[PDB]
Amino acid sequence: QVDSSPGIWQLDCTHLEGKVILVAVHVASGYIEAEVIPAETGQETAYFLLKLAGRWPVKTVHTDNGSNFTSTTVKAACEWAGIKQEFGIPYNPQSQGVIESMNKELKKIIGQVRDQAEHLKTAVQMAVFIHNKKRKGGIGGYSAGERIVDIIATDIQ
- Residues engaged in binding ligand GE7 (CB under 6 A): 43, 46-47, 50, 72-73, 76-77, 80, 116-119, 122, 126
State the virtual CA torsion across 33, 7, 50, 150 in degrees, nearest 10. Answer: 50
Interaction between residue 102 and a copy of itself (CB under 8 A):
no
Between helix 144-156 and helix 120-133 the angle, nearest 10°, is 60
At residue 67, φ and ψ (nearest 5 deg) are: -50, -35
Tell me the closest approach of the beta carbon of residue 49 to ligand GE7, in angstroms. 8
The answer to whether 19 and 31 are in contact (CB under 8 A) is no
Tell me the β-bridge partners of 43. none
Alpha-carbon gap, residue 30 to 144, rounded angstroms: 5
Indicate the pairing of strand 19-26 with strand 31-37.
antiparallel
Interaction between residue 90 and Mg ion (CB under 5 A):
yes
With CB under 8 A as the contact rule, the residue among 54, 137, 138, 140 that binds a copy of itself is 54
Residue 12 binds which entry of Mg ion, ligand GE7, a copy of itself, none, with Cβ cut-offs from 5 to 8 Å by kind? Mg ion
Q: Which is nearer to a copy of itself, 51 or 104 (CB)?
A: 51
Q: Judged by CB under 5 A, which stretch of 57-65, 107-115, 123-131, 137-145 contacts Mg ion?
A: 57-65
The answer to whether 96 and 64 are in contact (CB under 8 A) is yes
Q: Which residues bind a copy of itself (CB under 8 A)?
A: 31, 33, 47, 50-51, 53-57, 80-81, 121-122, 125-126, 128-129, 132-133, 142, 145-146, 149-150, 152-154, 156-157
Q: Which residues bind Mg ion (CB under 5 A)?
A: 12, 64, 66, 90
